[PDB]
Chain length 90, copies 3
């Protein structure tokens, strides 16, 4: 019905990422202290969750995008978004 969001943040600036699932597409908005901008994340899904962790100053993000019973993990490790090994039996 309404759009569905997930958010994560890191450091003390801070950096924030907000994922929005909207009519079966998930997009990303980004804050690194200098204003909101559109991020590179673009994947299909009706539902989104996210978690992230720092290794020093390098951010690692995992976005979990679901359509039906299939959840697909997407990984940011500094070098673009790549499909992760996550599987489930839903």
């Amino acid at each position: 019905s309404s759009v569905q969001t997930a958010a994560t943040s890191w450091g003390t600036v801070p950096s924030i990422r907000v994922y929005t699932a909207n009519n079966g597409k998930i997009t990303e908005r980004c804050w690194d202290g200098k204003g909101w901008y559109t991020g590179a994340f673009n994947e299909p899904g009706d539902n989104v969750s996210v978690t992230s962790w720092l290794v020093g100053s390098a951010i690692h993000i995992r976005v979990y995008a679901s359509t039906g019973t299939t959840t697909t993990e997407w990984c940011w490790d500094g070098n673009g978004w790549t499909k992760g090994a996550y599987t489930a039996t839903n």
Copy 2:
């Protein structure tokens, strides 16, 4: 049908905040080690996400509240809740 929640926590006590979206209104329950109480956050939304970060011992919280395609950011930085600069274009 069911209500929809988002949660964040910080420190080692810990402090926890649970946001619940219910029939278009989001409310807040709080734990700081001494029992659950109703927090000050009260905003419209059908969907809620949240993230938080520490700057030293000072907590900062961002709650993302959505109704239809409009997501509104709310900010706690120690001194009450204020509308954030987040915009999307959904």
Copy 3:
């Protein structure tokens, strides 16, 4: 019928937990740096959120599981999942 997910992570290995609400049941998938495996968490809910915090190297997790207007908190504190004191009046 789309599933709904929540995620948390900790440390820098990292450890990740992904909770999936699916036809009124919430299940758990786990990563601690080897493969993905099925976790012990199994509770009723149409909606799930989660937060976690470290006390030293010991993980503490709180999962908020909602069915209708009733949100139930589940606690991992290193030995097993136990019902938490969380209440709300939804």
